[PDB]
Amino acid sequence: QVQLVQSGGGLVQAGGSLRLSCAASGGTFATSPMGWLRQAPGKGTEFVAAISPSGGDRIYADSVKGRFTISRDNAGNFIYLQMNSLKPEDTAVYYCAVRRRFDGTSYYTGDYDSWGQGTLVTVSS
Amino acid sequence: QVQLVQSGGGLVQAGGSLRLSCAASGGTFATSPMGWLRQAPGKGTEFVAAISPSGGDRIYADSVKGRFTISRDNAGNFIYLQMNSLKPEDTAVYYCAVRRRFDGTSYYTGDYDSWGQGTLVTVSS
Amino acid sequence: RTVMVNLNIHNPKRSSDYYDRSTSPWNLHRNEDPERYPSVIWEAKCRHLGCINADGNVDYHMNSVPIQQEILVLRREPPHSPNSFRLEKILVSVGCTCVTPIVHH
Amino acid sequence: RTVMVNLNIHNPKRSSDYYDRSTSPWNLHRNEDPERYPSVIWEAKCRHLGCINADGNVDYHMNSVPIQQEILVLRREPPHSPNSFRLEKILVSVGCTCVTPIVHH
Ligand SMILES: [Cl-]
Ligand SMILES: [Cl-]
């Protein structure tokens, strides 16, 4: 229905900040709950944050709470993830995803569909 | 949006049964919660029964519970009220109404709009 | 001013499962009219007067409200003519949500 | 086969008040497209990820789900021609209901 393009991210020393961006190419996702997942290799797919269709309600994983913020435009063309005070725990491939299903709480990764290849964010010891 | 025609009813001795009927002339009310109110003169407008859009959920006033039953077709063209074991308490003008508003519980008469003149049901001492 | 339209209209099974799990669920009504394109429209009869709280029981301190939104349809007019038409806008319940009452006597 | 249509289209304020009191309320999105009749469609962005339990707080053990139903609209085709058209069927969120999740880890 849409393709999910991601920008931002790279290599950073601890305590720093990245700001990842995700865009709707070929369609919009205005009325869709959006989120961010992350996966480091070998490991499973973690929840990071999810954002209301209206942008007014936001949840965060217990590991990023207080450091990370999720936001979005109103056009349905952008969601953003801002990552502050980065820890090497935070090292992962990040995916913006659309909430396609509703089989669990908003926190349940299995309800979100990533599209593309991810965004690598490496945080240095 | 529709006009509400009522048939059945009259004069009955206690312990008996009437079965009032109500029809949708000029339109249907398939998807509308329906109900029945009653009013005897001077007195206020009592709730009697209300019925689900699908017909699957039915509530009754605490005075008719166990005697009266409400039901409806699926066409959206009919609702019925069946009144068994009648008491002279039951003497009133009956109105089938549509639930037009939602300012209260399903039990709250002020959410229902009668259309026409009523149906007189007199029950004899 | 009148105009031409080509009538060539331009996973579903999963949304019903989510709607069936709603707390103010609904059924379908076959709102059919032949002198009307589309011929058949399916609308929502809310399944309860209340909503379905944690027990799985109806809670009459709430309301199932059917959500009504107008949609575009065609009426054959002259009422018999299979050619001439009009664009009409009609109201149709599209599902149900649960709302809190304001009054509590 | 193509056909003619006359484009003469054929209390609201109170339904918003009921929808605003929903437990899975929503806002409006201006889904506008000029080569499209109707020009503007308003859809529902659910206002929360959960639903609003008795406290007035969001309950993330539930889901606000947007209700999606297809509707009829016209696309100017050839994409520039103000005359020729097609009837198209498109998906639009029409409001939100609250559904119970199945999984609880
Ligand atoms: Cl935060
Ligand atoms: Cl009973």
Distance between terminal CA atoms of chain A?
Answer: 40
Count Cα atoms within 13 angstroms, Cβ side, for C3.
Answer: 18
With CA atoms as reference, the chain D residue closest to C69 would be D94
Hey, of A102, A105, A106, A113, which one would you mutate to test binding to chain C, going by the most C CBs within 10 A of its CB?
A102
Given strand A68-72, what is the order of strands in its sheet? A3-7, A18-25, A78-83, A68-72
Across the interface, whether the CB atoms of A103 and D101 are under 8 A apart is answered yes
Tokens representing D62? 């539930």
Buried/exposed code over C33-56 (b: 16+ C-beta within 10 A; e: otherwise): eeebbbeebebbbbbbbbbbeeee
Q: What are all long-range contacts of A110-117, with beta carbons under 8 Å and residues at least 24 apart?
A: A110/D103, A112/A35, A112/A37, A112/A50, A114/A4, A114/A37, A115/A2, A115/A3, A115/A4, A116/A3, A116/A4, A116/A5, A116/A6
Residue D42: phi, psi to the nearest 5? -105, 125
User: What is the rounded CA–CA span in Å between residue B97 and residue B7?
Assistant: 14
D-chain residues near C63 (CB < 8 A): 18
List Cβ neighbours of C65 (8 Å cut-off, separation of 6 or more): B102, C24, C46, C96, C97, C98, C99, D18, D19, D22
Evaluate whether B31 touches C45 at the Cβ level (below 8 Å).
Answer: yes
**Rg, Å, chain D Cα set:** 18
Any bridge partners for residue B82, and if so which?
B19, B69
The Cα D100–Cα B11 span in angstroms is: 50
**DSSP H or E stretch at residue D15:** helix D12-20
Cα(C53)–Cα(C94) distance, integer angstroms: 22
Exposed/middle/buried for residue B124 (C-beta within 10 Å: 0-12, 13-18, 19+): exposed
Contacts of C17 by beta carbon, 8 Å cutoff, 6+ apart: none
Distance CA(A90)–CA(A84), nearest Å, equals 10
Three state DSSP letters for chain A:
CCEEEEECCCEEECCCCEEEEEEEECCCCCCCCEEEEEECCCCCCEEEEEECCCCCCEEECCCCCCCEEEEECCCCCEEEEEECCCCHHHCEEEEEEEECCCCCCCCCHHHEEECCCCEEEEEEC
Report the distance separating Cα C87 and Cα C52, nearest Å. 39
| Closest by Cα among A71, A57, A56 to A107 | A57
Query: Is the omega angle on the peptide bond into residue D25 within 30 degrees of 0, that is, cis?
Result: no
Give the single-character DSSP code of C17: H
Resolution (A): 2.8
Which contiguous run of DSSP H or E holds residue D17?
Answer: helix D12-20
Distance from C-alpha of D59 to C-alpha of A57, rounded to nearest angstrom: 11
Please give the C-alpha separations between residue C79 and each of C74, C84, C92, in angstroms, as whole numbers: 11, 9, 21
Experimental method, per PDB record: X-ray
CA of D25 to the centre of ligand 1 (A): 23
Phi and psi angles of residue B11, each rounded to the nearest 5 degrees, phi first: -120, 135
Residues 6+ apart with CB under 8 A from A91: A40, A121, A122, A123
From the list C67, C78, C43, D70, the residue with the least C-alpha distance to B28 is C43
Output the CA angle D36-A55-A6, nearest 5 degrees.
80
Cα–Cα distance for residue pair C14/A66, rounded to 1 Å: 35
Q: How many CB pairs under 8 A join C and D?
A: 146
- Judged on CB neighbours under 10 Å (0-12, 13-18, 19+), A22 is buried
Q: Which domains does chain B have, with CATH numbers?
A: 3-123 (2.60.40.10)
Output the six-digit token pair for A41. 């290799």
Report d(CA C49, CA C62) in Å as an integer: 8
In terms of Cβ atoms closer than 10 Å to its own Cβ (0-12, 13-18, 19+), residue C29 is buried
CA dihedral C103, C28, C22, C101 (to 10 degrees): 0
Domains of chain D plus CATH, in order, are 13-102 (2.10.90.10)
- SS3 state at D81: coil
CB C90 within 8 A of CB C70: yes
- Using beta carbons and an 8 Å cutoff, which residues of A are at the interface with C? 101-102
Q: Enumerate residues 6+ apart whose C-beta is below 8 A from D15.
A: C68
| Amino acid at the residue D103 | V
Residues across chain D: 105
Closest by CA position to D19, among listed C60, A30, C94, C30? C94
CB atoms within 10 A of CB A53: 29
Which chains would you list as touching A if contact means 3+ CB atom pairs under 8 Å? Answer: C, D
Ligand 1 centroid distance, CA of A64 (Å)? 7
SS3 of chain B: the string is CCEEEEECCCEEECCCCEEEEEEEECCCCCCCCEEEEEECCCCCCEEEEEECCCCCCEEECCCCCCCEEEEECCCCCEEEEEECCCCHHHCEEEEEEEECCCCCCCCCHHHEEECCCCEEEEEEC
Beta strands in chain C (DSSP E): 3-5, 26-32, 36-37, 40-46, 51-53, 57-59, 63-76, 85-99
Using a CB-CB cut-off of 8 Å, the residues of chain C touching D3 are 4-5, 7, 83, 85
**Which residues of chain C have a Cβ shorter than 8 Å from any chain B Cβ?**
26-27, 29, 31, 43-50, 58, 60-61, 63-66, 93, 99, 101-105
Q: Quick one: CA dihedral B3, B9, B11, B17, positive or negative?
A: negative
Tokens of C81: 């003519």
- Per-residue buried b or exposed e for A73-111, using 16+ beta carbons within 10 Å of the residue's own CB: eeebbbbbbbbeebeeebbbbbbbbbbebbbbbbbbbeb
**CA B67 to ligand 2 centroid distance, Å:** 5
Provide CB contacts within 8 A for D70, sequence distance 6+. Answer: D89, D90, D91, D92
DSSP helix/strand/coil, C13: helix
Q: Which residue type sits at C77?
A: E
Nearest one of B73, B69, B77, B62 to B36, comparing CA atoms: B69
Q: Please give the C-alpha separations between residue C38 and each of C63, D48, D86, in angstroms, as whole numbers.
A: 31, 34, 14
Nearest to C72 by CA among C99, C92, C94: C92
Nearest Cα to B82, choosing from B93, B73, B71, B90? Answer: B71
